[model samples]
Target: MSDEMKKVMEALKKAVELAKKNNDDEVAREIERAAKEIVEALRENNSDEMAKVMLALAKAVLLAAKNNDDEVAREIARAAAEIVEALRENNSDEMAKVMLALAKAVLLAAKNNDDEVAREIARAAAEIVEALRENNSDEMAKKMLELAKRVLDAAKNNDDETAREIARQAAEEVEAD
Candidate 1:
């Protein structure tokens, strides 16, 4: 396949390997470092590259966040947001990450969900969510729903299904919340 996709796959594999071999401090550090570097590349790379990187990061971090390594997932997401901003500035045409990253940002911000980070992510993601809802394009609406679930999933304290349902309903209702 494409080189960017290949790199992203490798990055994900490395993260998984690290998680599997959690006792191996050296490998774990290497994985963490590589993940950070991948984030850097995503921020600097073009839209296509950023999309691949964000997708891989999203899978890895979402699992990590769900499994209780919220900090790890948070770092991954925080980095992802940086890349999202990069994509926004360098290629506004590539906005898929805006929703995904905002979702993750909302999750990562769970450490302070009642504070600024959550608000920032909520506001940012909501901007796109609002626009897409207004457009009422079936595809865009579906994608936004998926992204909203990620945010609610990441941040909600012990009600994963409920949060997901809420996001789904919001999507269905085309509400701006």
Candidate 2:
């Protein structure tokens, strides 16, 4: 294996081990499962697949956060931010996927009408989407930004159906793109 792939593999293994050590068996399993797909993507140099893998990894972290492991979640969140930064310059499509992953997490968290958390997540996602616009002008990015804003508005108004509809449309956009 190439050095880069080796490094990614080792990191994923370490993450799984850490999750297990923390008694987060679900996350450990998810990390392991996701790692296989990531390893394949790395070997193939498939940036699109890699982007989706990143989203899956983020979901695992968000799940941990939802389960109340705030510290672990923050660690993963910081790592995600760094990953997003690293990809932003050359991988706008992948960067959008990464941003969408985080945005999905926030939207999911905001689904229940916790105004404080909802507004916070909405603002963050909106900001990230806006920043994405400054870098990318593609239809996919534009759609994502619009959906993000709609989600933010729905979240602010505690309109669960509206938020869900936007999320569904966003999902379709991602798939179609």
Candidate 3:
């Protein structure tokens, strides 16, 4: 892997391990910092690595939420949403990753047992769809279909009733196919 990719991978691994320990909030915080590093490194490159960075950010957001760190969660959400928009402007083909990240963010956000995060992700996803519509490219359709499948899977696996419902609602458009 390239040096940049290696840096991200190492940081991500550390973050995940840290979160799993559940012994302290340090791991989640580390992940958040690493995510910013990865974003800064890859944002200009526009490499496919953007997806992984976004996913990492989502994971960090979840970890923070899991710890009842509302401020961290909101910050991550804003950053995650911003990255997604920047990627969309390029009309990139990372839709599958985008959808997955959004789903995860929404789900984690909902763990606050609040509807706000889920709503935020759904709105972001809708905005993405709107941008993709301009391309009118069949490629996006396929990505949407994949995203729908992922949403359904997450909904089915998630124990939270409200989160599952949110997943279902988000997947509704893609499920029509």
What is the Cα-based TM-score of model 3? 0.31
Best by the lDDT measure: 2
Q: Report the C-alpha lDDT of model 1 over 92-172, residue by residue, as the tens digit.
A: 333444455453545455444344334334444444455453554555556655665556454554333443454455455
What's the candidate order when arranged by decreasing lDDT?
Answer: 2, 3, 1
Q: Tens digit of lDDT per residue, candidate 3, span 66-166?
A: 54344445444454544445444553455545545554545454454444444444344444454444442456556554554544344344433543454
Candidate lDDT values, in order: 0.48, 0.50, 0.49
In candidate 1, stretches whose alpha carbon ends up further than 4 angstroms from where it belongs are 1-12, 21-45, 48-98, 101-103, 106-165, 170-177
Candidate order by TM-score, highest to lowest? Answer: 2, 1, 3
The per-prediction tally of clashing pairs is: 0, 0, 0
When 2 and 3 are scored with lDDT, the better candidate is 2
Every candidate's CA RMSD: 10.5, 9.8, 10.6
> What's each prediction's TM-score?
0.32, 0.37, 0.31
- Please say which candidate is ahead in lDDT: 1 or 2: 2
Worst 10 residues of 2 by lDDT: 75-84
Positional deviation of 85 in candidate 2, in angstroms?
21
